[PDB]
Amino acid sequence: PNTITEENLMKMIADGRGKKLVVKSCKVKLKLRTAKYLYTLTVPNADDAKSIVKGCKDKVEVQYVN
Amino acid sequence: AKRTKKVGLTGKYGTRYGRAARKQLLKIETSQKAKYTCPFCAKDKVRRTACGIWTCRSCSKTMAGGAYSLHTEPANAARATIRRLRLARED
Amino acid sequence: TKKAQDSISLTLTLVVKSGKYTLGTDQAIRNIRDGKAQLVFMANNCPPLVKSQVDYLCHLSKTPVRVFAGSSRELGIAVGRQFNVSIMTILEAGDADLTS
Amino acid sequence: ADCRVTCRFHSTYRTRSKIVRYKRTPGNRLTSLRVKKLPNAPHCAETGKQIHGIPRVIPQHLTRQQRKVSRPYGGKLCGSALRAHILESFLNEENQALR
Amino acid sequence: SQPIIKPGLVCIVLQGRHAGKKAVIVEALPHNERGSYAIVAGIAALPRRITNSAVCRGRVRSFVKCMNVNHLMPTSCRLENNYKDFISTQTVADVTKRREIIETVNKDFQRRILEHRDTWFFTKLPIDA
RNA sequence: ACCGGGAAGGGGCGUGCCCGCCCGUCGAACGGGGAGCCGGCGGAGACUCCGGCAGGCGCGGGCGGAGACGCGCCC
RNA sequence: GGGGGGCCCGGGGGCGGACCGCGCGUCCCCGGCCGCCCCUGAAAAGCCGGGGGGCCCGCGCGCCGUACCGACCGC
RNA sequence: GAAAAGGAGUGGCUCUGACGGGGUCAGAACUGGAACGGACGCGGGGAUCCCGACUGUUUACUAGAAACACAGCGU
Ligand SMILES: [K+]
Ligand SMILES: [K+]
Ligand SMILES: [K+]
Ligand SMILES: [K+]
Ligand SMILES: [K+]
Ligand SMILES: [K+]
Ligand SMILES: [K+]
Ligand SMILES: [K+]
Ligand SMILES: [K+]
Ligand SMILES: [K+]
Ligand SMILES: [K+]
Ligand SMILES: [K+]
Ligand SMILES: [K+]
Ligand SMILES: [K+]
Ligand SMILES: [K+]
Ligand SMILES: [K+]
Ligand SMILES: [Mg+2]
Ligand SMILES: [Mg+2]
Ligand SMILES: [Mg+2]
Ligand SMILES: [Mg+2]
Ligand SMILES: [Mg+2]
């Protein structure tokens, strides 16, 4: 498991390296499940909004707060 | 202040083994614990590592020598004689 | 023999009293490269590779090089030190002559 | 409380490759974790000192770049030894040809 | 008696990536601070075996650098260089110059090799037999 | 049955060349030896199951620094 | 010595994986030294470096042990 | 030889000083059947003679020694 900067995150998205994304509410955690590692990014909700506006439609995103 | 009068380093033996043996060991053990002058290093750093093996702790040469001293008298004399015999073989 | 060695003693003393000199191999090399070294003077137990390169550098510099006829301890004593000295380089001779 | 643990290995004979340390787990438990022996690093062929630049990891787990140094005789000689060899070769050439 | 570090002298390299390789003193630098240095052009790669029965094989790789003189060993040998004319201040920290400088010195070294010049300079020193 | 080197002692490949002096895949569940952690579930098993997160070994679609140093194979 | 650097260091911290301080001591491992020997404290498979010369995504990981016990030997 | 032989103190409570948070060491007043290592743990001592120098070993199951070994000495 490891942490990632958002532009590398979009590289991963745009070259189809992820199988599922998770949004965790708490500062929001974005969790990306790739072949090798699980990558995590932490952004405020304002930035989560635009990252998901930019989210991929070949990409299953699932929400989570509890 | 001085701690023993005569026994020196043989005070480790206590009252055991008799006078003649302890007298011999004082001499032997002082000789084998001494520091010697490195014939290359130029410095007085040679210590014994095994019975006939002496290492200079500064320049790190190893040398073959006596059991309890770095040089022996027979070897001094032999080396002098062999050097003289060589020189006589140079015309 | 005795006359010559006592002259060597007197000149080493004069150089260290009034003159320019260096003790040590690294300074000896730097000065021989520059060509500031009137004389170079070694000990009989100088390490042989170091001796080879000193003699070669001196052959290219035309700096004369001699041998002290005593250990590095002896050279330390002779220039007035408590430590061993493999090379002494004499840069200016002062009130000495360097006739050796 | 009671923090006593049982042995983790096949036998309990405590040789130098069967050493553990202790650590607390997220489930509030005292667990044993093996302590690998640490291999030495390569040493100089001429003087026997640790070669500078190589980590103490078996080379099977290191990439090629990490297992080397960038100099002639990079991982074999320490550099003082290399200098001494170069000087020996050149000066001996000089004293064997032209007197 | 006389200085040895002069701008035509051939040295052996002692430390760094090019240790035990021959080079020429392109220039000598003064002694202000940090010590004593010299612009030096040297051979990084020599050509190789060419049977009768080849450009890549017979190409020649050089290097120019400023080096500490304490890391050099002078020689009797000498190479009458033509590189003083080529500007020696743009060599350093001006990389755009330095790559083209290496190109224009590679060509010349291969040329000297073709005309069979400086046998001692273009031969390899035997180490650690 | 016991004892033992002085024997024309095997390999690479790709034909035809080239290299070669002569043993045991016997002998250690404590020596050497690539690579594992957490949470959970059962009447009886778990570093072995299940979930999660990793690691190892395999197979298929020439540059920088003054320098100490930094950043595909085969014999 | 002083000033500035390089490499190793079974460790620690921050982010991931996912309540707050302060102490003496014990056990274990590690470090640099110092002492000792008419005592000097295994080997090999396997893996790698040097010199010289010639030239990301998928799939898999076979065989055997594994319950329990001082329930063992002394009728 | 030696802990030779022989003497004296030691609880509780209230205080004081010394060492850079931490206990130790030193000192004083008061007090208790004329008590204090209050259980527990824990040498009796000395004057001599014989044998073997010493640490070590032995008749598993009636003998641990003055017997064997030993460094040293000699052939
Ligand atoms: K028979
Ligand atoms: K076997
Ligand atoms: K075996
Ligand atoms: K075993
Ligand atoms: K085994
Ligand atoms: K090599
Ligand atoms: K089991
Ligand atoms: K009291
Ligand atoms: K007895
Ligand atoms: K005893
Ligand atoms: K006894
Ligand atoms: K009996
Ligand atoms: K008995
Ligand atoms: K007894
Ligand atoms: K007895
Ligand atoms: K007996
Ligand atoms: Mg094992
Ligand atoms: Mg069980
Ligand atoms: Mg079990
Ligand atoms: Mg007895
Ligand atoms: Mg009996």
How many other C-beta atoms are found inside a 10 Å radius of the C-beta of residue C25?
19
3-class SS letters over C60-90: HHCCCEEECCCCHHHHHHHHCCCCCCCEEEE
The one-letter amino acid code at B62 reads T
Closest nucleotide over all strands to D29 (CA to C1')? F38
Q: Tell me the ligand closest to D10's alpha carbon.
A: 17
Asked whether strand F has any atom less than 7 Å from the CB of E41, the reply is no
Check B40 against C84: CB less than 8 A apart. Answer: no
D31 C-alpha vs ligand 19 centroid, how far in Å? 18
How far is residue D49's CA from residue D75's CA, in Å, rounded to a whole number? 12
Q: Taking the CA atoms of E31, E34, E35 and E41 in sequence, report the sign of the dihedral they define.
A: negative
How far is residue E64's CA from residue E90's CA, in Å, rounded to a whole number? 12
Is there an interface between D and E (3+ Cβ pairs < 8 A)? yes
CB D67, CB D75: distance < 8 Å? yes
- Exposed (0-12), middle (13-18) or buried (19+): which is B54, by Cβ within 10 Å? buried
CB E1, CB C63: distance < 8 Å? yes
* Closest to E104 in 3D by CA, of E123, E122, E118, E83: E83
* Closest to E4 in 3D by CA, of C30, B40, C39: C30
Q: Whose structure tokens read 């290219």?
A: C60
Check C53 against D87: CB less than 8 A apart. Answer: yes
Q: Which of the 12-71 residues on chain B come under 7 Å of nucleic strand G at their beta carbon? A: 29, 32-33, 49-51, 67
How far is residue A31's CA from residue A20's CA, in Å, rounded to a whole number? 8
Rg (CA), chain B: 18
Q: Is D53 annotated as a binding residue?
A: yes
Tell me which chain D residue has its CA closest to the CA of residue C52: D91
Q: Is D84 on the interface with C (CB under 8 A)?
A: yes
CB C46, CB C75: distance < 8 Å? no
Joined tokens for residue D52: 């500078």
D9 C-alpha vs ligand 19 centroid, how far in Å? 13
Q: Which residues lie closer than 8 Å to A32 by C-beta, 6 or more apart? A: A4, A9, A12, A18, A20, A21, A38, A39, A40, A41
Instruction: Decide the pairing of beta strands A38-43 and A2-3.
Output: parallel
Instruction: Decide the pairing of beta strands A38-43 and B53-56.
Output: unpaired
Give this entry's resolution in angstroms: 2.8
How far is residue D88's CA from residue E128's CA, in Å, rounded to a whole number? 9
How far is residue B64's CA from residue A46's CA, in Å, rounded to a whole number? 80
- Residue to test with chain D: of E11, E13, E21, E128, most D Cβ within 10 A: E128
Asked whether strand F has any atom less than 7 Å from the CB of D4, the reply is no
Q: Is B45 helix (H, G, I), strand (E, B) or coil?
A: coil
Q: Whose structure tokens read 């990014």?
A: A41
Joined tokens for residue B53: 């093996």
CB E46, CB E63: distance < 8 Å? no
How many other C-beta atoms are found inside a 10 Å radius of the C-beta of residue B72?
13
CB C98, CB C11: distance < 8 Å? yes
Q: Which chains touch B (3 or more CB pairs under 8 A)?
A: C
How far is residue A36's CA from residue A26's CA, in Å, rounded to a whole number? 26
Check C52 against D95: CB less than 8 A apart. Answer: yes
Q: Is D49 helix (H, G, I), strand (E, B) or coil?
A: coil
E73 forms beta bridges with E12
Buried b (16+ CB within 10 A) or exposed e, E79-107: bebebeebebeebeeeeeebeebbeebbe
How far is residue E79's CA from residue E45's CA, in Å, rounded to a whole number? 18
Asked whether strand G has any atom less than 7 Å from the CB of D58, the reply is yes
How many other C-beta atoms are found inside a 10 Å radius of the C-beta of residue C21?
21
Q: In Å, what is the separation between the CA of B18 and the C1' of H49?
A: 25
Closest nucleotide over all strands to E65 (CA to C1')? F66
3-class SS letters over chain E: CCCCCCCCEEEEECCCCCCCCEEEEEEECCCCCCCCEEEEEEEEECCCCCCCCCCCCCCCEEEEEEEEHHHEECCCCECCCCCCCCCCCCCCCCHHHHHHHHHHHHHHHHHHHHCCCCCCCCCCCCCCC
